[PDB]
Amino acid sequence: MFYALYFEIHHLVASAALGFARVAPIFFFLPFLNSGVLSGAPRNAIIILVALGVWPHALNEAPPFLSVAMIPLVLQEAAVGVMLGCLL
Amino acid sequence: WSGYLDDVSAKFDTGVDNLQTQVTEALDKLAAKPSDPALLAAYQSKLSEYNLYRNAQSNTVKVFKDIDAAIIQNFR
Amino acid sequence: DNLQTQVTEALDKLAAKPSDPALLAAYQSKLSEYNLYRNAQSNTVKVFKDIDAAIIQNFR
Amino acid sequence: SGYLDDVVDNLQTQVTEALDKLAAKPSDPALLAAYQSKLSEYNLYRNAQSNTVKVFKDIDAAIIQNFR
Amino acid sequence: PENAVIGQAVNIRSMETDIVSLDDRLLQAFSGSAIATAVDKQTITNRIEDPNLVTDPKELAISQEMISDYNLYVSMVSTLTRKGVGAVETLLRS
Amino acid sequence: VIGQAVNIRSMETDIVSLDDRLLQAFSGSAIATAVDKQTITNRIEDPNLVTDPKELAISQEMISDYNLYVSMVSTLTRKGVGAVETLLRS
Amino acid sequence: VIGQAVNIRSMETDIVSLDDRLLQAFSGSAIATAVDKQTITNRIEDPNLVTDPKELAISQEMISDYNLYVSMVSTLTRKGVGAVETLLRS
Amino acid sequence: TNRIEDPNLVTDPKELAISQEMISDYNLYVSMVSTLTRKGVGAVETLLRS
Amino acid sequence: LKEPVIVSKMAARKKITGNFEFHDPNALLEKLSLQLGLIWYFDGQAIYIYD
Amino acid sequence: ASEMRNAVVSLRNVSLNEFNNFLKRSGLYNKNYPLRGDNRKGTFYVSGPPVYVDMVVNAATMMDKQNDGIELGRQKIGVMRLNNTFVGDRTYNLRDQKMVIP
Amino acid sequence: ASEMRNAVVSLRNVSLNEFNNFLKRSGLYNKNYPLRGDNRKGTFYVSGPPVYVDMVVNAATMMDKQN
Amino acid sequence: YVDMVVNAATMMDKQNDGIELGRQKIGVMRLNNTFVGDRTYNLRDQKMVIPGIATAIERLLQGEEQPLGNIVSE
Amino acid sequence: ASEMRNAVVSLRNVSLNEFNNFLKRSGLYNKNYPLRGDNRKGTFYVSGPPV
Amino acid sequence: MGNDISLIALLAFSTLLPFIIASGTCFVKFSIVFVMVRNALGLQQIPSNMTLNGVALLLSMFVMWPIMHDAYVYFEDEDVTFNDISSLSKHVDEGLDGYRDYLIKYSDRELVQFFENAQLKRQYGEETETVKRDKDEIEKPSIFALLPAY
Amino acid sequence: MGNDISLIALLAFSTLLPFIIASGTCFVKFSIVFVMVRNALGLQQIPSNMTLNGVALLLSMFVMWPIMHDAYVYFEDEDVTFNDISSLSKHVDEGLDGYRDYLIKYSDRELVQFFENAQLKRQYGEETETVKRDKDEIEKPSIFALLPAYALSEIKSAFKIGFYLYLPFVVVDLVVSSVLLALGMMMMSPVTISTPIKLVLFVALDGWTLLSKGLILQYMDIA
Numbered sequence A: 001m002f003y004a005l006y007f008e009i010h011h012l013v014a015s016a017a018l019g020f021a022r023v024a025p026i027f028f029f030l031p032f033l034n035s036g037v038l039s040g041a042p043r044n045a046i047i048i049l050v051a052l053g054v055w056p057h058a059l060n061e062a063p064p065f066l067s068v069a070m071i072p073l074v075l076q077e078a079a080v081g082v083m084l085g086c087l088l
Numbered sequence B: 001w002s003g004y005l006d007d008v009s010a011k012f013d014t015g016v017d018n019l020q021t022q023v024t025e026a027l028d029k030l031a032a033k034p035s036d037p038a039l040l041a042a043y044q045s046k047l048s049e050y051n052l053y054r055n056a057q058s059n060t061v062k063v064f065k066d067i068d069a070a071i072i073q074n075f076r
Numbered sequence C: 001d002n003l004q005t006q007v008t009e010a011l012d013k014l015a016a017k018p019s020d021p022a023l024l025a026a027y028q029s030k031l032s033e034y035n036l037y038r039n040a041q042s043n044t045v046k047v048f049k050d051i052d053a054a055i056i057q058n059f060r
Numbered sequence D: 001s002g003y004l005d006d007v008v009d010n011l012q013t014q015v016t017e018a019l020d021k022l023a024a025k026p027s028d029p030a031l032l033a034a035y036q037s038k039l040s041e042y043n044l045y046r047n048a049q050s051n052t053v054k055v056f057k058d059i060d061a062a063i064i065q066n067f068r
Numbered sequence E: 001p002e003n004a005v006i007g008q009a010v011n012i013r014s015m016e017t018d019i020v021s022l023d024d025r026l027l028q029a030f031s032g033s034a035i036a037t038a039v040d041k042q043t044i045t046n047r048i049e050d051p052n053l054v055t056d057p058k059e060l061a062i063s064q065e066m067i068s069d070y071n072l073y074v075s076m077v078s079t080l081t082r083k084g085v086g087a088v089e090t091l092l093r094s
Numbered sequence F, G: 001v002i003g004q005a006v007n008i009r010s011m012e013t014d015i016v017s018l019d020d021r022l023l024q025a026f027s028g029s030a031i032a033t034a035v036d037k038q039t040i041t042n043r044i045e046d047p048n049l050v051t052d053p054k055e056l057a058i059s060q061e062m063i064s065d066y067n068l069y070v071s072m073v074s075t076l077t078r079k080g081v082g083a084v085e086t087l088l089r090s
Numbered sequence H: 001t002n003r004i005e006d007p008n009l010v011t012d013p014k015e016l017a018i019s020q021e022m023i024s025d026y027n028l029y030v031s032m033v034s035t036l037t038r039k040g041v042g043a044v045e046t047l048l049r050s
Numbered sequence I: 001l002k003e004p005v006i007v008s009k010m011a012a013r014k015k016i017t018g019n020f021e022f023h024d025p026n027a028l029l030e031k032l033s034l035q036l037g038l039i040w041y042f043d044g045q046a047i048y049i050y051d
Numbered sequence J: 001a002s003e004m005r006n007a008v009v010s011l012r013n014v015s016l017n018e019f020n021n022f023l024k025r026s027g028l029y030n031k032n033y034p035l036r037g038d039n040r041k042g043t044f045y046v047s048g049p050p051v052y053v054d055m056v057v058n059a060a061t062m063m064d065k066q067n068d069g070i071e072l073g074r075q076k077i078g079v080m081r082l083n084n085t086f087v088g089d090r091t092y093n094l095r096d097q098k099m100v101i102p
Numbered sequence K: 001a002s003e004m005r006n007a008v009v010s011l012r013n014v015s016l017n018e019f020n021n022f023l024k025r026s027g028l029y030n031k032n033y034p035l036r037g038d039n040r041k042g043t044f045y046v047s048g049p050p051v052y053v054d055m056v057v058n059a060a061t062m063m064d065k066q067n
Numbered sequence L: 001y002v003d004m005v006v007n008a009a010t011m012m013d014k015q016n017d018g019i020e021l022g023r024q025k026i027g028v029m030r031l032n033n034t035f036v037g038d039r040t041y042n043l044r045d046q047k048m049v050i051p052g053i054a055t056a057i058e059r060l061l062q063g064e065e066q067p068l069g070n071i072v073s074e
Numbered sequence M: 001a002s003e004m005r006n007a008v009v010s011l012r013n014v015s016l017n018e019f020n021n022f023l024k025r026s027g028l029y030n031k032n033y034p035l036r037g038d039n040r041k042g043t044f045y046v047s048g049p050p051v
Numbered sequence N: 001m002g003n004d005i006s007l008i009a010l011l012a013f014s015t016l017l018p019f020i021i022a023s024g025t026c027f028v029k030f031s032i033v034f035v036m037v038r039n040a041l042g043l044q045q046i047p048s049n050m051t052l053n054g055v056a057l058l059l060s061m062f063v064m065w066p067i068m069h070d071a072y073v074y075f076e077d078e079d080v081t082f083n084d085i086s087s088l089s090k091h092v093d094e095g096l097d098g099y100r101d102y103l104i105k106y107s108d109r110e111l112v113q114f115f116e117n118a119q120l121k122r123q124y125g126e127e128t129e130t131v132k133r134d135k136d137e138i139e140k141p142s143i144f145a146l147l148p149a150y
Numbered sequence O: 001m002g003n004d005i006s007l008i009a010l011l012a013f014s015t016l017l018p019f020i021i022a023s024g025t026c027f028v029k030f031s032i033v034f035v036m037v038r039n040a041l042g043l044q045q046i047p048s049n050m051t052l053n054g055v056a057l058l059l060s061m062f063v064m065w066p067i068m069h070d071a072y073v074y075f076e077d078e079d080v081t082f083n084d085i086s087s088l089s090k091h092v093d094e095g096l097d098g099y100r101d102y103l104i105k106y107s108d109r110e111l112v113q114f115f116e117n118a119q120l121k122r123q124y125g126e127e128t129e130t131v132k133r134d135k136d137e138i139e140k141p142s143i144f145a146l147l148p149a150y151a152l153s154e155i156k157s158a159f160k161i162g163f164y165l166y167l168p169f170v171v172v173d174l175v176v177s178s179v180l181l182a183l184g185m186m187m188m189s190p191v192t193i194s195t196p197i198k199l200v201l202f203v204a205l206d207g208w209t210l211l212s213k214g215l216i217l218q219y220m221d222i223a
């Protein structure tokens, strides 16, 4: 099926985008990751790579959240990330 | 159910009321007696008239397609 | 809509007798003029609204 | 289609049908003259549709970029 | 119609009165713009699906205008909205 | 002439039925159904339909809309994180 | 030639402040623009002018000059506003 | 340039079929180099300006 | 007057005071038109008044 | 009450009296909001509740295009005998020559 | 009162006297807001409440095409 | 119910468009008082041709678009 | 139960009596969810579980 | 696809979000009390402003997140129909009452009424206020009137 | 839409909008007043500037709205189309009078006039003298003169208010020290006791309600 690789790349970037919401706050709190040290073009490139390194589901199948209101979800994930940043 | 280039073809097909059949009739008569000069003289007229009918019809539809395609190209 | 009406009249008269050379000669002219008119109108409409879009893009 | 799922005829059909009829006798002037105008109207329809879909997507892309 | 002209005796305007709230004045704008755009998009689509409209120069010339006017309208609403929120942001971060 | 009608008193909207489709940015279920169909297909029907102008005009809608949806989510997450950082510094 | 008239004397005004110099430059440009646009529109619909090579050769120039002039005024206005914004942000 | 002036080369069907290939290759070569250099400097801009 | 009356917005800014007798309206209306600076018309269905 | 709707309708092939009968046979007629117009002509005005107005306008406009295939122009043949002259083109023979009159 | 409307109309096939009669049979006719013009010609002026003006302008202009 | 009714009605309608309902019939009519064919007379110095009924009627109706009616002396 | 589904289907060559027999020999037929229509004609309604 | 204006409204809202939170939410109270207590104990920078703001933010979400989620659940509702700009305005306003009620609960009636007057009365030639009986206006103070009073 | 140049003007205006609000509007006064109150109470971080400026912006919106609405309605009016530069320019000018007349109540006459004198074309001798009648001079000085005079006068009037706000707290701060000295506890820092007193006094006085009301009353008229 011809377009399947194209869709499979878009599923990847949608998953990475929703992972950034939960990984970036940690990079804000820790003293060796905050923007007093790591800044400019490296910063996003590294955060995204980590988020893809830890996402739990196979990257090549459609993301399950397409049916849901995006804002309540993004705020939920950011709150979780803030809690983890404190505990670490 | 049809567009506007069919309205433009049909203006010829309803304009020349009957020619489309008259040609076939003339041919049916001439085929029976090719050596008759009155039949030959009639057929020459019908066949020429039909040839022009078809050419004028096709060139007019070509021109209206060239106007439309140029307007649509500007929708960008 | 005068030049739109004239061409549809000419076409009826022609369709009535497609082999009359006086009618053919008239129709050639009417159709050519209409053909130039449409193109000129469409092109200027385009120019006028590409200028507006370029203004908005300048502050956007 | 023969199918509806509960919860006229278009140029796409008319072209396929006139081509199908023509191909049986490629040398008949009535059929040729009937086919020229259907193939022309189908070409115009299928261009105009795609050009306007393209305009609506470029509008939405510009909005998202403007709020970046 | 074409054989008729229809005026208004004198254009008094009750909606020139400011009396509604600063937020009702917002809801009116939002609701009216949303309806206007949905109607315009639908009309443009119909003018293309229908075979006698998409193949007559007289009709195509009109559709070209409809498309351009739609484009300009939406682009300007977007621009002014951005400029507006950007002002708030500029002041409050100062 | 034939079948002519006009509504005189009030601007009751009739070209469209006014509906909750006004109140959403993306028909995410319609995306999720189309994305299903173009991805469940693995060795059924046939590949390579680069060429028929009727299906090729249906693919154009999906290929555009999914690119826009993915582009939007990328901005929303940045905004959210930026709002949290803004409050925590201030 | 036939039915033609020209305004000999322009009305006049004092110019005493940057405010009036600005309103005057604005009003001067607005009218010239409206006049040009109308003129072009008429030249596109008089059929003696749409179809004559000599008249089309003129309309081409009028359209070009209009485009260039409005693009210049747009650019220089945006440059001025950007210089103010830059200094106050700094 | 020299092939376009020798009257023997400019009027023989055999030789023209060669000139057409030569000019198509020159065009593609220069478009390639001019694209990759622009990408190359664009990387440096991205890292330093950012 | 036995007719509806329509007053232009710009005319509605003016103010009047005193004790008035509507004994012959058309004769009163024209006189006040001249004193106040109004202009008026009558189409047969309604009276219109402008500045 | 404020929701009343109003419309004007102008048929081509179906007289008002033709449409009233359809409403009556259908059992859809309502004497509180009757159609107002000329039973002879084909133009009328209607006002009332939304559902009623919409149904009326739709039904009328469909009836109109349905009856449009009715053909009403017809040709006739008239036979006429001449009493005082020969019908056909008339030949005389002069001493050596035929000559002919229209 | 401030909502009065008015219009001016020209009919290419139906005389004013032809139209008034239709209004009478319809029972739409209203002597407080009669039409104003030349019964012989086809041009007239009308004014009144907005639903009345709109009804009149539409009925007359459609019937002008029917005939 | 409404959706089932609507779709069933529309598709039953479309399944009949190909059906043709018109028909042609043939009438045989003997002439009681005259010869059917075109008559021709040969004379010492003249030839005369007279068209028959079929010839005259065909020559009259040829090319007619409208239906006929009222001959007078779904 | 709220996953039940409905359709209307219109055949051009075959007919309902032709198709029932097929289901029967297949052993697919189900008297709980029969096809509803005119056996002589070629249009029918069906409702049931998705598969 | 969707609607191009509802898209603008979504993106705009998400830019204003932190200022709304900072000015019309219990975050206002929580972030103040902690810092005051910290000063009273007489040893600044223990706990950090990072700790305090982080906790205050988290607690505010328990109060406010259900109200936003309820509003989106109100709008994602496929059974509505409309006819006019008024009928749409009413339904959109009705969607915000869940938030309006919270602001009404925690703010002063008379300061709210004062701003409700001040939006208009520069227009007004009159002194009478009874002219609308309370039952509508008491329910429907505007949100811009409620915010600063809260 | 409309005249292409009118469009450019609208977009330029909307681009400069925040600097106008920040330099020619009551927002200038409210922003200062709230921060001075925070300093008078002696708080370094409470409330946030992001809260104070939000409140100040909302309060300013009420005061400024009616002028923006009136000017909008004035320009969204199809009444006329214009023959000439002088007719158009005087039509434009007559639309800004509502704002011009707002600025005139609060800027100061002598400073305004000095700035108007400053704009005139230079002369080689000292400029030729003039006196001008009120319909220009009182009614219609130019906006490029009014605007900075307004900004400066507003700042001044803001400092004045802050001065009065400080006085009662200064009284408190002195009294409390004198009483601690009367009790002999000379070494204790009095800030530890004066601060809560100040807070108590401000809440019992309900200073926020009074400030928010009276500031609006200076511009609105409410009955």
Ligand SMILES: CCCCCCCCCCCC[N+](C)(C)[O-]
Residues within 6 Å of the ligand: A075, A076, A079, A080, N058, N061, N062, N063, N065, N066
């Ligand atoms: C922490 C913010 C992000 C997640 C949203 C939490 C919403 C509030 C849920 C509270 C439930 C409390 N409970 C179980 C007593 O109802």
